[PDB]
Scaffold this active site. Structure first.
Site, PDB file in Angstrom:
ATOM      1  N   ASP B  25       6.442  -2.417   1.380  1.00 10.10           N
ATOM      2  CA  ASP B  25       5.190  -1.770   1.010  1.00 10.10           C
ATOM      3  C   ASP B  25       5.341  -0.422   0.323  1.00 10.10           C
ATOM      4  O   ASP B  25       5.543   0.589   0.987  1.00 10.10           O
ATOM      5  CB  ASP B  25       4.375  -1.620   2.291  1.00 10.10           C
ATOM      6  CG  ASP B  25       2.947  -1.223   2.039  1.00 10.10           C
ATOM      7  OD1 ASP B  25       2.609  -0.866   0.893  1.00 10.10           O
ATOM      8  OD2 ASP B  25       2.167  -1.267   3.009  1.00 10.10           O
ATOM      9  N   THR B  26       5.211  -0.404  -1.003  1.00 10.05           N
ATOM     10  CA  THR B  26       5.352   0.839  -1.757  1.00 10.05           C
ATOM     11  C   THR B  26       4.195   1.805  -1.513  1.00 10.05           C
ATOM     12  O   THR B  26       4.301   3.003  -1.805  1.00 10.05           O
ATOM     13  CB  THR B  26       5.460   0.557  -3.271  1.00 10.05           C
ATOM     14  OG1 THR B  26       4.277  -0.120  -3.723  1.00 10.05           O
ATOM     15  CG2 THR B  26       6.691  -0.311  -3.558  1.00 10.05           C
ATOM     16  N   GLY B  27       3.097   1.281  -0.979  1.00  7.49           N
ATOM     17  CA  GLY B  27       1.934   2.106  -0.703  1.00  7.49           C
ATOM     18  C   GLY B  27       2.009   2.798   0.644  1.00  7.49           C
ATOM     19  O   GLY B  27       1.151   3.620   0.975  1.00  7.49           O
TER      20      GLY B  27
HETATM   21  O1  BED Z   1      -3.665  -1.885   3.798  1.00  4.17           O
HETATM   22  C1  BED Z   1      -2.801  -2.519   3.183  1.00  4.17           C
HETATM   23  N1  BED Z   1      -3.075  -3.733   2.584  1.00  4.17           N
HETATM   24  C2  BED Z   1      -4.369  -4.396   2.592  1.00  4.17           C
HETATM   25  C3  BED Z   1      -5.203  -4.107   1.369  1.00  4.17           C
HETATM   26  C4  BED Z   1      -5.278  -2.906   0.579  1.00  4.17           C
HETATM   27  C5  BED Z   1      -6.166  -2.877  -0.563  1.00  4.17           C
HETATM   28  C6  BED Z   1      -6.951  -4.025  -0.898  1.00  4.17           C
HETATM   29  C7  BED Z   1      -6.878  -5.224  -0.114  1.00  4.17           C
HETATM   30  C8  BED Z   1      -5.993  -5.242   1.020  1.00  4.17           C
HETATM   31  C9  BED Z   1      -5.733  -6.350   1.984  1.00  4.17           C
HETATM   32  C10 BED Z   1      -4.354  -5.933   2.578  1.00  4.17           C
HETATM   33  O2  BED Z   1      -3.239  -6.349   1.771  1.00  4.17           O
HETATM   34  C11 BED Z   1      -1.376  -2.033   3.056  1.00  4.17           C
HETATM   35  O3  BED Z   1      -0.825  -1.954   4.400  1.00  4.17           O
HETATM   36  C12 BED Z   1      -0.063  -3.096   4.801  1.00  4.17           C
HETATM   37  C13 BED Z   1      -0.917  -4.264   5.278  1.00  4.17           C
HETATM   38  C14 BED Z   1      -0.779  -5.546   4.622  1.00  4.17           C
HETATM   39  C15 BED Z   1      -1.547  -6.677   5.009  1.00  4.17           C
HETATM   40  C16 BED Z   1      -2.499  -6.567   6.087  1.00  4.17           C
HETATM   41  C17 BED Z   1      -2.670  -5.315   6.765  1.00  4.17           C
HETATM   42  C18 BED Z   1      -1.883  -4.175   6.361  1.00  4.17           C
HETATM   43  F1  BED Z   1      -2.101  -3.066   7.027  1.00  4.17           F
HETATM   44  C19 BED Z   1      -1.196  -0.723   2.245  1.00  4.17           C
HETATM   45  O4  BED Z   1      -0.010  -0.690   1.438  1.00  4.17           O
HETATM   46  C20 BED Z   1      -1.055   0.430   3.161  1.00  4.17           C
HETATM   47  O5  BED Z   1       0.283   0.451   3.734  1.00  4.17           O
HETATM   48  C21 BED Z   1      -1.411   1.730   2.496  1.00  4.17           C
HETATM   49  O6  BED Z   1      -2.730   1.668   1.868  1.00  4.17           O
HETATM   50  C22 BED Z   1      -2.889   2.554   0.743  1.00  4.17           C
HETATM   51  C23 BED Z   1      -2.947   4.029   1.143  1.00  4.17           C
HETATM   52  C24 BED Z   1      -1.971   4.951   0.610  1.00  4.17           C
HETATM   53  C25 BED Z   1      -1.995   6.329   0.974  1.00  4.17           C
HETATM   54  C26 BED Z   1      -2.998   6.817   1.886  1.00  4.17           C
HETATM   55  C27 BED Z   1      -3.976   5.914   2.428  1.00  4.17           C
HETATM   56  C28 BED Z   1      -3.956   4.521   2.060  1.00  4.17           C
HETATM   57  F2  BED Z   1      -4.856   3.713   2.571  1.00  4.17           F
HETATM   58  C29 BED Z   1      -1.418   2.659   3.645  1.00  4.17           C
HETATM   59  O7  BED Z   1      -2.255   2.513   4.537  1.00  4.17           O
HETATM   60  N2  BED Z   1      -0.490   3.644   3.645  1.00  4.17           N
HETATM   61  C30 BED Z   1      -0.407   4.602   4.708  1.00  4.17           C
HETATM   62  C31 BED Z   1       0.705   4.278   5.666  1.00  4.17           C
HETATM   63  C32 BED Z   1       1.224   2.990   6.085  1.00  4.17           C
HETATM   64  C33 BED Z   1       2.317   2.941   7.026  1.00  4.17           C
HETATM   65  C34 BED Z   1       2.876   4.172   7.539  1.00  4.17           C
HETATM   66  C35 BED Z   1       2.358   5.454   7.120  1.00  4.17           C
HETATM   67  C36 BED Z   1       1.275   5.480   6.184  1.00  4.17           C
HETATM   68  C37 BED Z   1       0.570   6.661   5.597  1.00  4.17           C
HETATM   69  C38 BED Z   1      -0.063   6.048   4.322  1.00  4.17           C
HETATM   70  O8  BED Z   1       0.886   5.995   3.260  1.00  4.17           O
END
Ligand code: BED
Lengths: 99, 99
Positions: B25-27
């Site tokens: 996960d690059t995000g």
């Molecule tokens: O929600 C997700 N997908 C879902 C999604 C997103 C957009 C549209 C649709 C869908 C459906 C899913 O694929 C992803 O998560 C995996 C994931 C995958 C599948 C199901 C559940 C799930 F959690 C996503 O890449 C997050 O990781 C990331 O979201 C973007 C973001 C960046 C920076 C600040 C806030 C923020 F929010 C995020 O929350 N980053 C934070 C984070 C994560 C782990 C540790 C620390 C930190 C701090 C931040 O960098």
């Protein structure tokens, strides 16, 4: 180009004639942008993230330029913490993960 | 290897002798795994994503093998819906975004 991950992979995107900064997120299935005005009708969608779900507005066939690469697809709009370019558009620009 | 984004980029990781499936996960700034026990002391942390924040336990200097590549870094443990390999570890295996 090749983007390393020592910092957040933030790029400039152009949508609705406006420049915005968004994150290239391989962990996001879809693309979601912060509240903004987009043309046409929208459909409801619920997306789940790390902290739960949020309701967003789904717009289809939206033109969006990512790093100069033109893409046309589904864009979600809602209370997202940051603008996110998800896999649906990453595939359109031919983005891949490599190591 | 080169990983396309037509499907979620899931890979097998090895941590604490356990094999788990995780998302590249690059995000994600950090790496967070579903509840499990890790050795050493830990400190609480709140991480926020789509949907809000969740409380996790932070462990430092944890060894993890991602697709055969060994990496060391901070690993967070908590109520995450899916195991996430974030940038803190992706960099260590030389993972880049390309298009
Ligand atoms: O929600 C997700 N997908 C879902 C999604 C997103 C957009 C549209 C649709 C869908 C459906 C899913 O694929 C992803 O998560 C995996 C994931 C995958 C599948 C199901 C559940 C799930 F959690 C996503 O890449 C997050 O990781 C990331 O979201 C973007 C973001 C960046 C920076 C600040 C806030 C923020 F929010 C995020 O929350 N980053 C934070 C984070 C994560 C782990 C540790 C620390 C930190 C701090 C931040 O960098």
């Amino acid at each position: 180009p090749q983007i390393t991950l020592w910092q957040r992979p933030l790029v400039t995107i152009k949508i609705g004639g406006q420049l915005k900064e968004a994150l290239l997120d391989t962990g996001a299935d879809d693309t979601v942008l912060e509240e903004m005005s987009l043309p046409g009708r929208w459909k409801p969608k619920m997306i789940g993230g790390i902290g739960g779900f949020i309701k967003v507005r789904q717009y289809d066939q939206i033109l969006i330029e990512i790093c100069g690469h033109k893409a046309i697809g589904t864009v979600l709009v809602g209370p997202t913490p940051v603008n996110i370019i998800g896999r649906n558009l990453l595939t359109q620009i031919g983005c891949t993960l490599n190591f």
